[PDB]
């Protein structure tokens, strides 16, 4: 069946033909069902410079061609169908568009019979619409993680969204209040990277939209409050043959194969550049290497290291047959994040990279007793690392340079902003 028939069968009156730009912003046209057939073949036209794609106002329209397999009837508004799209320019997929960049990396891995599957942990906060405070003034205790009371106080919002994921078939399996006051996490089944990436992009839209209907606001900001735990977007990772075998399952340490350790070697080896992509904002660097929070731990990475089932490192091994990359934050691009992770891991496999020694220690407490490379400390340093990393920059194609350009502009803007701390501590010099 084609989209026009489906629209008629399911009662879809409009479609959002949607794409994700380099900064993660969802761009779309809302097209009435009468126009979907033509759009589905030829794509919907956009002026690319108006989005974060690093183009020019003089360029021809890009055409975003929807992937009919990605269709989602908005569970909160079923007369509307959401579609993920590949941006095309000059008759070909446009290499600066995140989804296109990911599919390229995926195609290279697939040609080696290695298929990335991943799940995302999209932690978010529920806050007042004005952004001044969390949504629940009674959520105050020092260790609020897994709080039953505060979770159930937001039951209506959380249950509504979980039930939508049940109906969409994502296989959600748990929800909780997370470690910061105001913060939540809703988990669902991993899938082929592309599937998860589209789900990741839609999920954020869904949470934000539903929150708003409830008179709340959701944020995925990496570090919205200085003294509270931040928003991670941990990525659990495994690589599979087309025949359905998990290449990461093995007889080695912690139930991992040498292929899993080499992939891990790639993450470790390329970590500095990876950070630019998966911690893509100035604020990202206040979540990494952060002072101890009120709850007693940041739970985010400080160092380029890994442990076993241990949440104090860049990588955790949570169970046999997979790796948890704890590095990414809530701002990480749903498509660029897996693309950069795969480029790194693939190079790790191809070069049989050594991940180094597993550290079975609490890095927050004992990191001083061990020599370990620190992660890049600010956005500018991460971006330089990205630019200097041939495997990453090469693997992401033109997206990498465009991304770096934008982040450098953001940095230049940020660095000129006077802060209150400066006024307080310098006025009397």
Ligand X SMILES: C[S@](=O)(CC[C@H](N)C(=O)O)=NP(=O)(O)O
Annotated binding-site members: 121, 123, 173-174, 178, 185, 187-188, 190, 234, 236, 238, 311, 316, 321-322, 324
Check: CB of residue 345 under 8 Å from CB of residue 280.
no
Residues 220-239 that bind ligand ADP (CB under 6 A): 234, 236-238
Residues 199-258 that bind Mg ion (CB under 5 A): 234
Smallest CA-to-CA distance from 313 within 379, 262, 358 is with 358
CB of 154 to ligand X, least distance (A): 17
SS3 26: strand
Stretch that binds ligand X, among 96-104, 200-208, 230-238, 405-413 (CB under 6 A): 230-238
User: How many C-beta atoms lie closer than 10 Å to residue 132's C-beta?
Assistant: 7
136 lies in the binding site for ligand ADP (CB under 6 A): no
- The closest of 92, 99, 23, 100 to 60, measured between CA atoms, is 92
What is the separation, in whole angstroms, between the first and last Cα of the chain? 72
Residue numbers 101-160 binding its own copies by CB under 8 A: 127, 129, 131, 138, 141, 143, 145-149, 151-153, 155, 158-159
Residue 166 or 258 having the CB closest to its own copies: 166
Q: Which of 21, 121, 139, 347 binds Mg ion (CB under 5 A)?
A: 121
311 binds ligand X (CB under 6 A): yes
Query: Segment contacting its own copies (CB under 8 A): 192-200, 204-212, 239-247, 258-266?
Result: 204-212
| List 4, 28, 37, 47, residue binding ligand X (CB under 6 A) | 47
Alpha carbon separation from 102 to 12, 20, 53, 184, 398 (Å, rounded): 29, 12, 15, 28, 12
Q: Is 423 helix (H, G, I), strand (E, B) or coil?
A: helix
123 counts as binding ligand X under rule CB under 6 A: yes
Q: Are the CB atoms for 299 and 311 separated by under 8 Å?
A: yes
- Binding to Mg ion in span 147-206, by CB under 5 A: 185
Residue of the chain from 88, 118, 204, 407 that contacts ligand ADP (CB under 6 A): 118
d(CA 23, CA 277): 10
Only segment of 24-32, 46-54, 119-127, 257-265 that touches Mg ion (CB under 5 A): 119-127
- Whether the CB-CB separation of 183 and 124 falls below 8 Å is answered with yes
Query: Does position 321 bind ligand ADP by CB under 6 A?
Result: yes
Among 3, 6, 12, 27, binds its own copies (CB under 8 A): 27
User: 258 to each of 80, 250, 261, 274, how far by Cα in Å?
Assistant: 46, 7, 5, 22
Our CB check for ligand X shows the closer of 1 and 426 to be 426
Q: Does 30 bind ligand X (CB under 6 A)?
A: no
Over the range 51-70, which residues count as b (16 or more CB within 10 Å of their CB) and which as e?
bbbbbeeeeeebbbbbeeeb
Residues 24-63, mask of contacts with ligand ADP (x by CB under 6 A): ---------------------x------------------
Contacting range for ligand X; rule: CB under 6 A; set: 34-42, 156-164, 228-236, 254-262: 228-236
* Residues 6 or more apart whose Cβ sits within 8 Å of residue 417: none
Q: Which residue is nearest to ligand ADP (CB)?
A: 119
Q: Rounded to an integer, what distance in angstroms lies between the CA atom of residue 143 and that of residue 375? A: 27
Tokens of 73: 């009837």
The site string for ligand X over 173-192 (x = CB under 6 A, - otherwise) reads: ------x-----x-------
Q: Sign of dihedral through CA atoms 98, 103, 109, 115?
A: positive
CB within 8 Å of 421: residues ≥ 6 apart: none
Is 121 a residue that touches ligand ADP (CB under 6 A)? Answer: yes
Nearest alpha carbon to residue 327 among 346, 311, 345, 349: 311
User: Which residues have CB under 8 Å from 207's CB, separation 6+?
Assistant: 122, 124, 161, 186, 218
Q: Which of 26, 175, 187, 281 binds ligand ADP (CB under 6 A)?
A: 187
Which of the choices ligand ADP, its own copies, ligand X, none does residue 287 contact, using the CB cut-off of 5 to 8 A by kind? ligand X
410 binds, among ligand ADP, its own copies, ligand X, none (CB under 5 to 8 A by kind): its own copies
Residues 6+ apart with CB under 8 A from 384: none
Least CB distance from residue 61 to ligand ADP, whole Å? 6
Instruction: Give contact residues for ligand ADP (rule: CB under 6 A).
Output: 45, 117-119, 121, 187-190, 234, 236-238, 246, 318, 321-322, 324
Interface residues with ligand X (CB under 6 A)?
A: 47, 50, 121, 123, 179, 185, 229-230, 232, 234, 287, 299-300, 311, 326
């Amino acid at each position: 069946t084609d989209l026009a028939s489906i629209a008629r069968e399911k009662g879809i009156e409009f479609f959002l033909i949607s794409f994700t730009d380099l900064l993660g912003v969802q761009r779309a046209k809302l097209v009435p069902a009468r126009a979907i057939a033509d759009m589905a073949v030829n794509g919907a036209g956009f002026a690319g410079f108006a989005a974060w794609l690093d183009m020019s106002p003089a360029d021809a329209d890009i055409l975003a061609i929807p992937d009919p397999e990605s269709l989602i009837q908005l569970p909160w508004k079923p007369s509307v169908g959401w579609l993920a799209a590949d941006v095309h320019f000059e008759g070909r997929p446009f290499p600066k568009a995140p989804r296109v960049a990911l599919k390229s990396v995926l195609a290279r891995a697939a040609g080696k019979d290695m298929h990335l599957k991943h799940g995302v942990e999209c932690e978010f906060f529920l806050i007042q619409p004005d952004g001044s405070a969390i949504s629940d003034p009674a959520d105050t205790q020092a260790k609020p993680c897994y709080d039953q009371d505060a979770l159930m106080r937001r039951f209506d919002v959380i249950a509504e969204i979980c039930s939508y994921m049940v109906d969409l078939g994502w296989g959600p399996y748990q929800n909780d209040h997370e470690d910061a006051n105001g913060q939540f996490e809703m988990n669902w089944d991993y899938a082929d990277a592309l599937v998860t990436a589209d789900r990741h992009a839609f999920f954020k839209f869904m949470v934000k939209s539903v929150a708003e209907r409830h008179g709340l606001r959701a944020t995925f900001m990496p570090k919205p409050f200085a003294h509270l735990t931040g928003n991670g977007c941990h990525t659990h990772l495994s690589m599979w043959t087309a025949a359905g075998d998990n290449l990461f399952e093995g007889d080695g340490e912690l139930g991992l194969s040498p292929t899993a350790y080499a992939f891990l070697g790639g993450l470790i080896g390329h970590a500095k550049g990876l950070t630019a992509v998966v911690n893509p904002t100035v604020n990202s660097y206040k979540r990494l290497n952060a002072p101890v929070t009120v709850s007693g731990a940041t739970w985010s990475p400080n160092t380029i290291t890994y442990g076993g089932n241990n949440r104090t490192h860049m990588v955790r091994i949570p169970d046999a047959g997979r790796l948890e990359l704890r590095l990414p934050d809530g701002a990480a691009n749903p498509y660029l994040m897996p693309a950069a992770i795969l480029a790194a891991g693939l190079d790790g496999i191809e070069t049989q990279a050594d991940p180094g020694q597993r550290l079975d220690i609490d890095m927050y407490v004992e990191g001083h007793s061990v020599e370990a490379e620190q992660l890049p400390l600010n956005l500018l340093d991460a971006v330089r690392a990205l630019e200097a990393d041939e495997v990453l920059a090469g693997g992401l194609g033109a997206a990498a340079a465009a991304f770096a350009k934008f982040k450098r502009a953001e940095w230049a803007d940020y660095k000129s902003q006077l802060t209150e701390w400066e006024r307080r501590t310098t006025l009397d010099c």
